Amino acid sequence: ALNQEFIEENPPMKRVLAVQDEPQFIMDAFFDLKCVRPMPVYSVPGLIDHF
Amino acid sequence: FGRKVPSNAKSQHNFSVIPSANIQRSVFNRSSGYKTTFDAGYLIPVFLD
């Protein structure tokens, strides 16, 4: 029927894969952020009246 | 075959570097007089700082 079970992505990976009962994808990901932030790059303790 | 992804090890190392101390150097004259009596052949310590 045209419903939730029909439109949700559900490819039959279990039949095209040689090894049974292990996760389909193993992934390594790396996130390289350049950040400008409202804080110093290293904070030294001190400066009581300041900020 | 695939290409390897980087490690974060270099950015983690950089966050651990402490900043240099700000020293506040200055130049001034440290003149001093010293007066004494001594005899020949001895090593006399006339200046100490």
Q: Rounded to 5 degrees, what are φ and ψ at A36?
A: -100, 125
Q: Which of A29, A41, A44 sits opposite B5 (nearest CB)?
A: A29
Tokens of A19: 């090894």
Question: How far off is chain B from A28, nearest CA to CA, in Å?
Answer: 7
Report which of A19, A18, A27 is spatially closest to residue B2, judged by C-alpha positions. A27
Rg (CA), chain A: 25
Distance of CA B43 to the CA centre of its chain: 31
Number of helices (H), then strands (E), in chain A = 2, 0
The DSSP 8-state label assigned to residue B2 in this structure reads P
Tokens of A6: 């029909």
CA pair distance B17, A41, nearest whole angstrom: 10
Hey, which residues 6-25 in chain B have their CB within 8 Å of chain A?
6-8, 15, 17-19
Resolution of the experimental model, in Å, one decimal:
2.6
B17: burial class by Cβ within 10 Å (0-12, 13-18, 19+)? exposed
CA distances from B2 to A10, A17, A32, A46, B36 (A): 26, 19, 19, 49, 84
Identify how the structure was determined: cryo-EM
The DSSP 8-state label assigned to residue A14 in this structure reads H
CA pair distance B20, B23, nearest whole angstrom: 9
Nearest-CA residue of chain B relative to A41? B15
CA pair distance A32, B25, nearest whole angstrom: 40
